[PDB]
Amino acid sequence: GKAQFGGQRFGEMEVWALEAYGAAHTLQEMLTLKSDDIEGRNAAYEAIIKGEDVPEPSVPESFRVLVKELQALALDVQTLDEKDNPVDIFEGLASKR
C-alpha cells in the first residue's frame, strides 16, 4: 500500500515453471515461508536474523483456512498417518478446552 511495497504474485504459470524444475523446496517456500505460513514466515525471519539456516516449513494458512472453510460445510477433512491414523496440521489449537 502506502510505504511497504507489497509482494509479487506467484502465478500458476510460474508454479509450473518451478514444478518442471526439480525446485521442490523453492516451490514449497513460495507457498509457505514466503506467503502463507503464519508461523513459518515468523520463525523464518528470526532464523535468518540469527544467521540460522531457515527452518523447515510449517503448514500454510492457505491450507488451514481451507480445511476450516470446508469444515464450515458438513464435510470433514482429516489428514492421516503412515498407517491410516490422525496427524495434526492445526498445531494445538483444535483439541478442546
Partner 1 sequence: KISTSDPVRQYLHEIGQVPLLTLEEEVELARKVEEGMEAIKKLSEITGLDPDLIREVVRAKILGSARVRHIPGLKETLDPKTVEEIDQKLKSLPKEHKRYLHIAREGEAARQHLIEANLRLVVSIAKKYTGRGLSFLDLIQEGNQGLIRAVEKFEYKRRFKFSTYATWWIRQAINRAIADQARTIRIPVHMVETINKLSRTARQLQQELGREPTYEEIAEAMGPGWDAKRVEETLKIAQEPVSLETPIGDEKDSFYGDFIPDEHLPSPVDAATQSLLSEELEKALSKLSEREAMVLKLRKGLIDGEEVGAFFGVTRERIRQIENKALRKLKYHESRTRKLRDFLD
Partner 2 sequence: KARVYPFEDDVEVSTGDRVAPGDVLADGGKVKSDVYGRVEVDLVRNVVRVVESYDIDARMGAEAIQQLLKELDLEALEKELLEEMKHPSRARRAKARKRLEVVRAFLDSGNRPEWMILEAVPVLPPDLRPMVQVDGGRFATSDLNDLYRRLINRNNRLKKLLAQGAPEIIIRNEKRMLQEAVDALLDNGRRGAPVTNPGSDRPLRSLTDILSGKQGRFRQNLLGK
Partner 3 sequence: TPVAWKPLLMGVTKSALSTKSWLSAASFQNTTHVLTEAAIAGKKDELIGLKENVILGRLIPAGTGSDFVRFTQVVDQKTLKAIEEARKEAVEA
Q: What residues make contact with partner 1 under the rule CB under 8 A?
A: 1, 38, 41-46, 49-50
The item of partner 2, partner 3, partner 1, none sharing an interface with residue 2, based on CB under 5 to 8 Å by kind, is none
Interface pick for partner 2 out of 3, 49, 74, 80 (rule CB under 8 A): 74
Binding of partner 2 by 39 (CB under 8 A): no
Comparing C-alpha atoms, which of 57, 66, 68 is closest to residue 27?
Answer: 57
Grid cell digits, residue 82: 503412515
**For Mg ion, which is the closer residue by CB, 17 or 70?**
70
With contacts defined by CB under 8 A, name the span among 17-25, 44-52, 69-77 that binds partner 2.
Answer: 69-77
Residue 70 DSSP class: H
The item of partner 3, partner 2, partner 1, none sharing an interface with residue 6, based on CB under 5 to 8 Å by kind, is none
Torsion of CA 24, 29, 35, 40, to 10 degrees: 130
Q: How far, CA to CA in Å, does 75 sit from each of 63, 70, 78?
A: 15, 6, 10
